[PDB]
């Protein structure tokens, strides 16, 4: 494994230098964290909340399945994939389906995520043969998209603009140039985002 090679190099270098250095930990961490698992799990978690009976749900299910397969095979890049994904998520039919689902006492969402893990293993969408199941455990026991009421991470890029306006007061996403005294390093070239502080 390339990630195994990275781990081996990291341990070799750390034991050689007698210290754990920023450079070498950055190298190993990047090798470990470079993978499309995040987006494929995003897409399959979105697929989970669907209903296997609705025909609109079937259309959305197949669209998202194609999207995940394309990103996994590497034909379509991450930014284009996110544009497709955010459109399909912001759709009104998807939100109606998710709202209908969250009402019942027994929702098929858990089975959806489990079948997503199995499909990821079989189709070879993962990094190792059994990575999808630890991914599933993490998504279940830790704050992620699998635990939100809609099936996507709680960002305003995946929310409705009409739903965005009435909740938060943000304007009426850059610092105006007239603000010469905002912060130590804050300037007009520093961007801001609606529902988060990436700093």
């Amino acid at each position: 494994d390339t990630e195994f090679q990275a781990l081996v190099e990291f341990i070799e270098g750390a034991s050689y230098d007698q210290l754990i250095s920023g450079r070498r930990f950055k190298k190993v961490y990047d090798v470990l964290s470079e993978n499309d698992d995040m987006f494929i799990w995003l897409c399959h978690t979105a697929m989970s909340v669907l209903n296997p009976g609705d025909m609109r749900s079937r259309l959305i299910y197949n669209h998202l399945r194609i999207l995940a397969e394309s990103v996994a095979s590497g034909e379509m890049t991450q930014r284009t994939a996110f544009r497709f994904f955010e459109s399909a998520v912001r759709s009104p039919a998807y939100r109606e389906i998710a709202k209908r689902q969250l009402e019942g006492g027994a929702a098929t969402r858990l089975a959806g995520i489990s079948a997503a893990a199995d499909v990821m293993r079989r189709m070879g969408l993962t990094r190792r043969p059994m990575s999808s199941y630890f991914e599933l455990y993490q998504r279940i026991v830790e704050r992620s998209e699998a635990m939100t009421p809609w099936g996507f991470p709680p960002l305003f890029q995946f929310e409705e603009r009409l739903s965005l306006e009435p909740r938060l007061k943000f304007f009426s996403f850059w610092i105006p140039p007239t603000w010469n005294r905002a912060g130590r390093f804050l300037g007009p070239h520093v961007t801001l985002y609606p529902g988060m502080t990436p700093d």
Binding site: E3, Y29, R128, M130
Partner: peptide, 21 residues
């Protein structure tokens, strides 16, 4: 496999020291 991958996750999360290395 689950234990191995949890250990790898924690290693990526940087909860090891020079003794562990």
């Amino acid at each position: 496999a689950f234990k191995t991958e949890h250990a790898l996750f924690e290693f990526s999360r940087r909860k090891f020291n020079r003794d562990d290395v």
